[PDB]
Amino acid sequence: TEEQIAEFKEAFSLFDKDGDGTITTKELGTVMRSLGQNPTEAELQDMINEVDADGNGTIDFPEFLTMMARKMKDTDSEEEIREAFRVFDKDGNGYISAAELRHVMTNLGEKLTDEEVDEMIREADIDGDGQVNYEEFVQMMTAK
């Protein structure tokens, strides 16, 4: 895990770009200004109270390592994605219609791009059956 801790340390230093060893809301907002994602101050404070665990409101190397150390295939995450996908299926039997997914992904959320929505359709399709099942899509989600 030496390469892992080294790469997260250098990423933290790159985001800091100041040498004080901490990530601030101003630095992060400058990062998005450089890359162009139009951040919001509410989103900034929301990620601040989320990632920070020491209660001091700043970002530290041990905190960043601890938050990055979590795994993605947790059974809690599996059940959470199960119940998240359940509400989008009106029938609730695991068979979700094509048109509902299409219009929801288009008009609701952050207005995801049509090409990547079509990518979602083509990879999350059970042999193009239309009434696709999200179980296999979630399984390939959790298989990385």
Add this chain to the structure above:
Amino acid sequence: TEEQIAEFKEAFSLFDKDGDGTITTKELGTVMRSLGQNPTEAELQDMINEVDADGNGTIDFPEFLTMMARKMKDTDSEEEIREAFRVFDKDGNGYISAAELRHVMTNLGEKLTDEEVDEMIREADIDGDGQVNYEEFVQMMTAK
């Protein structure tokens, strides 16, 4: 119900007047400015969280059809109007005095016009008995 869905669809399009298929607070406020009812932003957000059911804050054709599909003669509405009229009758025996209705309708509410208040008096009168009964008025309310 083809004529019904067609007329609600064309009414929705008329209110939209923009082609994006959604009704916004700005469009609705412009509508009241054109017709002259002096809307309030609080009232606009209050109707937004009411009619909208998808949780996205906008108005869609399926949502409009679903909200217009409800009936008016529901027994829940009957009981609600019963208990609403009960509080206005101090005696609570279904016999409500003329003067109390007169002064309440005049000075309380949105200051309803005197001519239409008199219209209310003349149609909601049990043969001009003064101490009128609201049961028949509610019955003709629910008979459309």
Add this chain to the structure above:
Amino acid sequence: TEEQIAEFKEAFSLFDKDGDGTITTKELGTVMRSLGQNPTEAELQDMINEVDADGNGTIDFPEFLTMMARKMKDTDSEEEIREAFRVFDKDGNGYISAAELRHVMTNLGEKLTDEEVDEMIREADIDGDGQVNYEEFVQMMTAK
């Protein structure tokens, strides 16, 4: 009670001074500006939600008559003033010291005038015993 209702009606008309039959916060604030008591908008809304009972936020002649019709010698008021005076007596045996009353009435409240505080001392004194008893003072309070 004809003279009573007449005098309260004419007092209500005098406070209205506009002919619409209602007392408003603007009218009341203008009254205090004329007489010079420096009102607060918080106090104005606080008296509005207090005196008004119809829920419409304005003041009417029937409401004013009903609120003025209450008596002053209610046993609930007697017990309320009992418990209010109890907290000011540390001993709690009905014997309240002179100095505590003096300094409390001076530095706490609305900074009551020294001459009228001394008036309070001289009338609420059990033969000038210093450790006066508030029972007789409350009794002469409730005897009008």
Add this chain to the structure above:
Amino acid sequence: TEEQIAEFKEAFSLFDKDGDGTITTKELGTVMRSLGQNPTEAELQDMINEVDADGNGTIDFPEFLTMMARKMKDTDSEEEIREAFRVFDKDGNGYISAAELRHVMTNLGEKLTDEEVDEMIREADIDGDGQVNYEEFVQMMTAK
């Protein structure tokens, strides 16, 4: 205790510096401006609702004497400092590591000065064992 009450009375008069016998937020803020600690209005109201006990929001000589009369070696304070120091020791057996205390005292709190942090290390050290025990440090805390 005559010297004690005299010295607290003269300190109260010195802080008042106005002759009205009360300490106000403006006076206290002027004091910090003179001495240079950069106070906050939130901190000022927070000390106001704390020290004041009469409920009038101001500071009086009896209140100041009563608040200064409390002792420092209360068993409640002993247990409170016990539980406060318990959370800083991950093991919870009374043996707290040197490095954790170092980095916490440096980067968390009000950014205490390095020299006085080193003073804390040198006096709160069990013969320089590194994994020091805070029991003796708290005991010398409570021994004045």
Add this chain to the structure above:
Amino acid sequence: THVQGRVYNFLERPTGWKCFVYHFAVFLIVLVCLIFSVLSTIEQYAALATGTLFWMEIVLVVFFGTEYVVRLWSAGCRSKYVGLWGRLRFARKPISIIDLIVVVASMVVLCVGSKGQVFATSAIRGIRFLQILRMLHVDRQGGTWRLLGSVVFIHRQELITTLYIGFLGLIFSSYFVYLAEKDAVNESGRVEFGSYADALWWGVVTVTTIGYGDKVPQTWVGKTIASCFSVFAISFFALPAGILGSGFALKVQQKQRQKHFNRQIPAAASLIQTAWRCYAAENPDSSTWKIYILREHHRATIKVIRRMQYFVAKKKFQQARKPYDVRDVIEQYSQGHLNLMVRIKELQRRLDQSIG
């Protein structure tokens, strides 16, 4: 006129203190009639009380008939009970049905010797005191036994589940104890396990903590299984009482949370006005169409606008009947914050126009 209303309040809807005293006296005379009816059942005073109490019982039934007559006559004040149709509607009320049943049961047979049915007929008069609480009879959704019995209705599903689990455990345990102790006979030469009816009876006794004292196996296995059954099932059996008590305390806490009674008047008035707006939307010739002002082809637009205003009024009224709550605080903060944001935006654009 007002005399009918006064006598109706005296009879059905109590107010003041004199009517409360009258209802108290009615409760005590009900207690007296029940108590002498129950003391008439004794064998020593079966005949003496029957002979003596004839005049008192006949004058009591005459008084009941007269009070029913005056109550139905005074029912004409209520709008629901006007005329012959209103009297018939009042008769269909459960309280009136019970009173009529009691009267007809009293007068089934005349000039006959008393029997056990006389005690049963007077026993029906016991529930008359409870009819004072149910004298309203506004609806059937929740009233008296249902209004405060809604605590059971609120918990109905899980109460049914708990009693079902208890019943299953009882019958299963009875089966196990019967199969295990078919050959077990305790002292005094009595076969404890002779019928599954007896097994179910003892299961009920154990779950009810009765402890009669006749049927208990002396086997160690039986003692252990009985101890396990007691430590497992008694809590579920006693659950409903604490359940209803805690729910009732919940609603008591909710009582102080309830919003002021006089604040719903503007909401109700707005609801009525919007209801009439919807009604007059059906009539293009109504004079209300000229209030806005020409406009000719926007009749459907005005109708649907009035309909959505009525929907908003319905939502406001439904929020009003709800007590002050976290949702109310959240929505109040949200509306205040959005008003502040709108005002700040308008100030900012005005300043930009001023200096730009």
Add this chain to the structure above:
Amino acid sequence: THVQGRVYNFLERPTGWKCFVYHFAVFLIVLVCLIFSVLSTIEQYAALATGTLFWMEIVLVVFFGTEYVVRLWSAGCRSKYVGLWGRLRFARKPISIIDLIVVVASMVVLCVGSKGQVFATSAIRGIRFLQILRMLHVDRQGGTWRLLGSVVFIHRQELITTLYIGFLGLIFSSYFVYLAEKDAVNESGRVEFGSYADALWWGVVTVTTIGYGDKVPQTWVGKTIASCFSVFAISFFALPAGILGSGFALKVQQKQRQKHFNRQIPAAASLIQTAWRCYAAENPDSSTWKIYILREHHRATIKVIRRMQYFVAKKKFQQARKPYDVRDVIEQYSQGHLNLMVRIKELQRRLDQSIG
């Protein structure tokens, strides 16, 4: 002077730790007197204890008389108990009445042999320990048995309803079981159903989960109806205990919600000042009329303004005694928001004047 107050706190209103120790010793000596009184009832020590305990009982009653005398003498510190009239008022207190009754019952007869009434007289001294909690006796609205018994009073209507339903079910079930099992005689040749008094007794036994062991029908119909009665009525019978426990936990939660004791001082002072303002409104010659300043004919205006100020002070004090709550949060947010709106409006009009 202060010695009277100190002895009054020592006697009636405890404080510190020495007075708590004294009250503890009083409770233990009450326990001792009750315990030797109850052990004096045994037949083996009926005479020996009576002969020996004469000196102890007479010195105990002398001590009780002396403590009553010193308590009434020290009552003069309280303003309600000053002088002969104050002593008489203190006598009318329920605790003083009970103590005087106990003393006179002790000294009814002198130099006489003891009897069962002596145990009864000493049994009245058991309640003396509870009088320490009720030593305040400030009022009768809620005190000791009523202060913490208000939980019953808060739930009184529905508790009465539940007990009424239980009583109706009990008497009805007794009637059904009697009518069904008139001819049912169990083992040992005893007629279980011989009196409706016995039927009501067994109904009480079943509803109380007593289970004596004498009167139970062996019929299957009787077993089924008893099982139904148990599964239907026991929950309602056990309701009040959980009801009062849940309500008490409710008020315990409310205790931490209670507002600070020292915050009501300004509200009480303002209430008193407004009360005097109303009083001096009755006196046009008072010096308070010159505080505002001429003004001559506005005496009624000043009087009614002071009266409405007193009403506002009453509302503020009534809000103060209420703990921090959702209503308090809502009104605080409302006043803050309206202050913000007023400030924004004044800023907007000022800017419009500045640049317009």
Add this chain to the structure above:
Amino acid sequence: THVQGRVYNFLERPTGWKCFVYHFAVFLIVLVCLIFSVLSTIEQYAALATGTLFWMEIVLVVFFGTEYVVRLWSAGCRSKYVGLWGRLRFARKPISIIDLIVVVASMVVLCVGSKGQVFATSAIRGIRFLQILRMLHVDRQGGTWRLLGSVVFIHRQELITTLYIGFLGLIFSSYFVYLAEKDAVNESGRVEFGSYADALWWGVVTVTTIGYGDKVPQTWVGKTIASCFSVFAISFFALPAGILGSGFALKVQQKQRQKHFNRQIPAAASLIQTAWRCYAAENPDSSTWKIYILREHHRATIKVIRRMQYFVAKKKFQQARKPYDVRDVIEQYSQGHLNLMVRIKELQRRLDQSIG
């Protein structure tokens, strides 16, 4: 197509009123089968009912087999129960296992005389009515007996502690009473204290308020220790029932606090979009990398930014599933206040630039 879904809702997931009526009829036929099975256990109708009910029992088991067959065939609509693998997965469900066990127990032996096992086999059909509630079987974390039994699970540690304390008290008290009353024999010439099994049995009886009526010492010391044991330990024994009732009322109060069901749709959609953003962070060749726009070496930066966006979405979704609460109000006020502060600061600096 849709017919499979309709029959699946008819069988497993009820909706409307016709399916509710069908489930009601299923519950009543379950009641009928259990009731004639239990009445078949009587000795008078052991043979007549067995001979007569052969046709009804065989047609009932045939109906159960056919309904199981149609349920498994209609399971193909569910994505979890598609194909042979899906049918096997449906078989592993506890409800399906119980149903298969019941069917095989019914058909163990054919054309044989009935015995006590026949009643046991039909007794297993009693739990079939409870399977309707557990027909979902979505998971095993909380379902039916576990979903509403989570009240026990929420209180599991302290419930275990209370029962442990009660068990310790029971066994200790049994030891004390045995050691004290080894020589104590009550009336009728029966040795009450002859076995520690009997001592533990009577301890259970006392803690359960049973009161059999056979084993009670008549010694005063035994009476006093029993009274102390009752006043000390019965409350702890009865604790769990009120505990679970109060916790259930707690969650009932929480039900009205719950946030609206339709408000979680945007949060779930954002969570899914961020999950895919993390997935495509693994693929530098994805077309999503061009949405921001060149940029070549910031692939890791984009990946970690999408990962932290996914973390933020996870936090938002976890806050959404929580009901409206004090924490929600506090965070809403905090975000509003910080937005106000930022706007005020920007206005102040803009004005300073304008006039400076």
Add this chain to the structure above:
Amino acid sequence: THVQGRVYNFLERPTGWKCFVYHFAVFLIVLVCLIFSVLSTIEQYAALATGTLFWMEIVLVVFFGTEYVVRLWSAGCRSKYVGLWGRLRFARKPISIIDLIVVVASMVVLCVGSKGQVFATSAIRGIRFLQILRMLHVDRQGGTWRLLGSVVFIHRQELITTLYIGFLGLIFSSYFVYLAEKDAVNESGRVEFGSYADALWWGVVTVTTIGYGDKVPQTWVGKTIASCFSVFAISFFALPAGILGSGFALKVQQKQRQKHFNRQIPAAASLIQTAWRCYAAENPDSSTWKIYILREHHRATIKVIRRMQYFVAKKKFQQARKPYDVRDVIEQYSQGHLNLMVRIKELQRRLDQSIG
């Protein structure tokens, strides 16, 4: 070094799953030792078990001694249990005292025949399983039986009041029934009312819903007074169980209200820093006096300023340990509103300076 900490966590403070498994095995071996001790009390296996279990009992006591030795040796990791003084301090702990008492009771006599005391000695080992929960023993204010028994302590005054009222009612009712039924003798020729000890016993039986089956008057007056006593006093007797259950559910609801564990770190650090500031206020020669900077005669001013800062830190820490609450929301809104007012005032005065 770390091995001592690991073995200390293995022994006293469990963590992970292996130590949980070890504690589970310890609980089961405690169950095994208790169960064979209690089965050794039977007369059939009194000698065989005693002869066979000698080796097992001696190896068990050797294991207990070795585990106590290793626990005391590993206690050196804790700062409170370092050195000989620390070992003595660990010995004074109640759990260590109980363990030492158990060991010395086991080894009182060697090479002797077993008796009833051997069962008593092994019975003391039952409480050893509860010592795992009380293994912390941080203080005596609240721990295990006191930590979760604080529910009784929170309700102690009113629980004492309720039990006192119940005891008074019991003794009074016993006196009334004795005086009334002195001459009442039931069937079987047994004098029910022969001793006030019997009267008090039956009062306890009635209040505990025991129902033995020996002493019940057959008089109607006795039946009525018993029914009144049951309907009046049983609720108060059963009050404490529901009281404690409701209070426990209260604190369970409070558990989810509790503030996050990691948010108190800055408050604790500030408290420690202010404590040292107060300490260095006693030392004018400390280097901290130069942090502010000359200033010479303001040493007392700096000392009292640091003292009031410490008071503020104490208040902040005391607010932190409290969970999120209505008071917290109110104070947060108050501070936000006053900050807004201050900012508005400064903006207004700045604008007045700018344009005035």
